[model samples]
Structure formats: C-alpha cells, structure tokens
Target: AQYEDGKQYTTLEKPVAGAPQVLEFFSFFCPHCYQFEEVLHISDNVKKKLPEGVKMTKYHVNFMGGDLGKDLTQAWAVAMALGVEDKVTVPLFEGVQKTQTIRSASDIRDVFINAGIKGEEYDAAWNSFVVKSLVAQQEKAAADVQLRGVPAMFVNGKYQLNPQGMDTSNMDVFVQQYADTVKYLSEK
Candidate 1:
C-alpha cells in the first residue's frame, strides 16, 4: 500500500533514467547518523532491504569536519571495495563513538583482524589505488552533490526522504516509512 496522505513521495525537477539510485549521505562520527542507522541499518552493518534495480550508495561525508571524516571515508571506500563492509562498518562507528578507542586508521583497521579478514588483505585495502580512487570519488561527490549534512537519504539523486515530521497517514515507523518512500519513489 502507498502512503495515505495522497503524497507518497515528493518529486524532484527531472525524471531519472534506468534504475533509481538511493544515495545516502552520512558519516561515522555523527550521533544522529548512528541513530538513523539503528533503524534503517543501511550502512550500520552493511545490510538493508533494498528494492530490485534500486542502486544504493553510502557517501561518507568528508567536509563536515576535518581529516577524520576523510580518513573514515577512505576506510569505508576500502571496506566496500574489499567486500568486508559487513565486518568493519559497525565496528568503525562503534569503535569511534561507543568504544571511543579509534584514534587512528590502524585503530579502525585492527577490528578487521577478528572479522575473518587477513592482515595482508586488509593491508592492501587500507589505501590501495583502487580504494584511493573510490575515496576520491566520495570526495568529489561531496562537492558535486551539494551535500551539506549527514543522514540525508536521496532517491534517484533528486528527492530527499524526510524521516521526521512527514505525515505518512499514520505510518509512524521511521524505517518502514523510509522503506515505503523508497518503494514509492523507485516505482517505475
């Protein structure tokens, strides 16, 4: 079922081509981002209920603060590239905020040791050229996409989902509400 308010989703200017993309602009240090992840769990542990043909990408925001965001961005790009996102995603976030022990990239890197990843494999993914390229793309996306905040979820690069204060005709669940929004927007 669609939203009951007759407004399933708020549209943007132009129509998108091909499969719709769900772009998540978020970070590891932001507490609200962690809160949102607790619900959606999109990038929290590298899993989510994505609709078919709906591309999802997590943009680890860099410009919000200093080099820490950049480092984490690179770390995330490396994690995604190496396919070990499930192991390190939550570890990095919690290692930073909850555990409060990640003072360096190596600090974040060490968590992978216990997550079924080898030291050498993690060594290359740490800053390999491929990982560097992906991190570079993430850096470019920050400026190109006008990304000025964290925990912003955009569908097809146009419509931003409002998790709070959105009248979903009595649909109050944050994760399900956003899931419905994604389905409504991604409907071709």
Candidate 2:
C-alpha cells in the first residue's frame, strides 16, 4: 500500500508468498486481448475455477501502441483504480481494435468520461499516486518479463503459461487446463 520508491510494485524474480497471484499482461490494442475478453471470457471463466484467496491482476502492456501504448496503459490504470474497468475496457477495445474510432488521447479520455466518470474525477485519479504507480509498474513489468506477445499470463510472477500447451480444441478442456495449470504453478 505504500507509494515509496521500489515499494509500489512486486518483485518479479520470485513467486508471491501467501495466496496465488495471477499477473496477466495484455494490451487494449491487441486483437487477441479483445477476443480473450469478449469472446473467450478467459479471465471470468478461469476465475470461476480458481481456489479462494487467489489474486488476479491485469497489467496493460505498453509495447503494443508505441507512444500511444503508454497512454492506453495509463487509461486502464485509471479505470482500474476508479473501479470502472468494466466500463472502459470493452468500449476502448472496440475503438482501438474494431471501429478504429479512437486516435488521440482526448478521445481515449472521453471513453472514461462517457463511462459515467466525471472528467474532473478522471483527472484526479489520473494524477493520483496510486494510478501513477500502476502505470509505471505496467512498463516495468513489460520490461522485466520475457513477454513474446499480449494476453500473457504468469503465475505468481514466476511461471509463464504456454498458450500452445493448452488443449484449445474445446472450451471445456481449455478453461480447465488453464485453471489447473495455474493452480499447479501456484503450489510450486
């Protein structure tokens, strides 16, 4: 909870001590991330299968959009801190990857505003220490983790899940395999 230097984010060299932690690195600009959320519903489905006290954190990657990637990452952080991620993510994903309606920072900000969040409220959280830390941590995590693509999942920050390793031939098998693998890694 502290905002002090080197304290805001967890170290990626090892697994978390207590409950299992699932750190998902994704980008709103990623088509796979969009499908994973809207179509596959991977997060929600996996959540249903995980044990109690397991923690899940989604870190929006900054490598996808170049300069704009950082802005999108910050936007996600702001939404998460404001408890409006459900409102902001899908709409922004549609604009960035589908409709192509979003091009500038102003347009992205409006996504948050139109989500029923006040412009001033968005601005306040955007400037808050917590949100700032989250954004910075996004970049740091991206740099630290050996990420080859978006929609990457790590268990306890130590193990990276192989997408090809899953049996996606069926949704039932895919979700169970993913969740069981996460639980298996958590115990390592």
Candidate 3:
C-alpha cells in the first residue's frame, strides 16, 4: 500500500526482471477505462514508448457484488487468449455503455463472430481449459488487488499508480501522464 499521487501507485514488493512489466487492472464496463483506451490508441506509440524488455498483462477485474462485471471479465480473458481482444474489447465497452449488448456467453461469442472469428473457433477458446483457468485467475486478481476503482495500472506487479492520480476531469492529460510515467518506470 503506497501512493502515486499521495498513496495510490505504490512500487511492487516483488517485481519481475528483464524490463519492467506494465499491468493494468481494468473492467470492460468501466467508462473511464474506455476513455483511457482512446488515449492509448490515439497517442503515437503510447505503449511503444516502453523500454526494450517491458512486458504486459492486462487483467480484467471482478469485485464483490460484481456480477455483470464478472461475465465481462470472463469475456475479456477469452479475448486475450484468442488474440481477438484487440477488436472485441472496444466494441464491448461501446456495446455495454451505449448499445446494451454483450451481456452473456453467447453474446460475447457473437462479438467475436461478427468480428470474423468462426463460431467453432470461438467455442474452442471460450470453453477451453485454458480460458476457464485464466478467467478464474483474473477474477481472483480483481478481489486480491482490492482496487478503489477500475483503470488501475501496476508496474512490475507493484501495487498502488497512475501519474494522473484518480482525477478523471482531464482524462486526456491523465492518460498521457500515466502512459509517460509507465514508460519512465519501465526504462528505470
């Protein structure tokens, strides 16, 4: 328990080696996270700014009383494994936030299917042992980290982050600040 802008983005007690690891604690239904994603996609080389050896594992979080979010968390894990997350997740946020879709297993599969991934292929990854295991793992992580909210970023397994703090008033600046900070930390 430390702080980034007071006491938030604390350094990791157990950091991995090589380059730094950039981990983001996120939820598909989170509006703020959706906005932040725009920054990542918009800014030139946001993640590319990371140092030579940096790694990334973006875990979807599901908290207590987090029922709908849990389903989304599962979908996120499947997307990660199938490598279609890049195309699937943005639409997911839009669907949930704006269109009211992406609510169940089949719905999530539909997202993939519409994106050009075959139904059989989606089923293969969606129910595979690998997806099941990781879904549980990501869910447990959501509980374990106990973040104050979504959009938490961790560097090298460290707890507590975000150079922009928790202030979403200026999301664009916040996103850029955090991305730059992550790059700085990875380089260090």
Candidate 4:
C-alpha cells in the first residue's frame, strides 16, 4: 500500500517503500502510546546519533474504541494534509492523555485551530479526497497487519515483544534499544 503521506495505519498491508530501520506502531488513542510519548523522548537523542541512511516512522494503529479510532485516523490524515502534523500531533495526544476526552473531527479541528491552523485550511484538508483515501487505506492496513493492539513496535518489519524482549521498564530505554535493533538489522 502506498502511504498517503499523513494517515494513521492499523497494519503493514503494503511493505514499506523506504529503507526505514525502525517502524513504531502506535495510535493516538492509546494510553501506551501516550505513556510512550514521554518515554520516547530519547528519540531526539537517538535521532541525532543514528547511523546514516537509517530512519524511523510511526504507524498509527487504531482498534480500541468505537468510531474514536476512525476519528483519530481521520484527524491524523487531515493534520498531515494541512501541513500541521507537528502542531497537532503532540497536542492531540496530550489532549487525550490529560483529559481522556473522546476525540471527534470537531474536537480535532478545535485542537488544530488552537495550534494555529486556520479554520478554512482545516476544513479543506478534512474534506479532501486524499485524507479520505488515506483513512480507507489505513483501515485496510490494520486488517492486513492482523494487529491485535496498539503501541506495538516493529523493527524492520519484525515484531518485538515488550518488556519481555527489551526487559526495560523505561520507555526511553526500550525506544533506544528498538533503534539499536533497527540499526543492527539494517547493517546486516
């Protein structure tokens, strides 16, 4: 499946086109993703030290709630299309983590607006066929990946069991190890 640039995914339906060393599977609605958000701060440091030609990408997996899963997927795509992903991604995560409020398009739009994205731009992006198509693709990906839950991590398309595999309670350490594993795999 061709990645639509800015949508959430539930699976690896299509093999990744790029040579990304690590793939982080997560969802906007996941508490683990939220907890990992703080723990994954090591990404900034790891990114700076990573081997050349290595890259990391995040896949948003949604399967935990009602339409909320779909809503977050749409929000991700819309934010990506609108070129406001950085602005809204963390805020959206923080919103859900802090308040545990259900996220809808309207709620996401308000978040985007708060993040300085214009209302019209948000509207246009939200309604774009690109966003819609990406959302559909994500749904298909989720089904194809056979994902059982969110906050899973894949190293070069291989699954890694949490805690048992990494043996670390610190998310930052797990993330760093994940990066190291990817780096190790990429060099093989």
- Cα-based RMSD of candidate 2: 7.9
lDDT by residue for model 2 over 14-128, one digit each (tens)? 5434423777888888887888888888887767767878878888987788877888988889988988877888899998998987888888998887789998998888889
TM-score for candidate 1: 0.80
Better of 1 and 2 by lDDT: 2
Displacement of residue 116 (Cα, Å) in model 1 is: 2.9
Top TM-score hit: 2
lDDT of each: 0.68, 0.76, 0.66, 0.62
Q: Which segments of candidate 2 are over 4 A away from where they belong?
A: 1-20
Comparing candidate 2 with candidate 4, which one achieves the higher lDDT?
Answer: 2
Q: Give per-model CA RMSD.
A: 3.9, 7.9, 4.1, 7.3
Instruction: Specify the poorest-scoring 10-residue window by lDDT in model 3.
Output: 1-10
Q: What residue runs in model 4 are displaced by over 4 Å at the alpha carbon? A: 1-21, 42-46, 101-103, 158-163, 169-172
| Best-to-worst TM-score order | 2, 1, 3, 4
* Position 142, candidate 3: lDDT: 51
Q: How does candidate 2 fare on TM-score? A: 0.83
Residue 38's lDDT within candidate 4 is 57
Candidate 2: the clashing residue pairs are: none
Worst ten in a row by lDDT for model 2: 1-10
TM per candidate comes to: 0.80, 0.83, 0.78, 0.75
TM-score head-to-head 1 vs 3, winner: 1
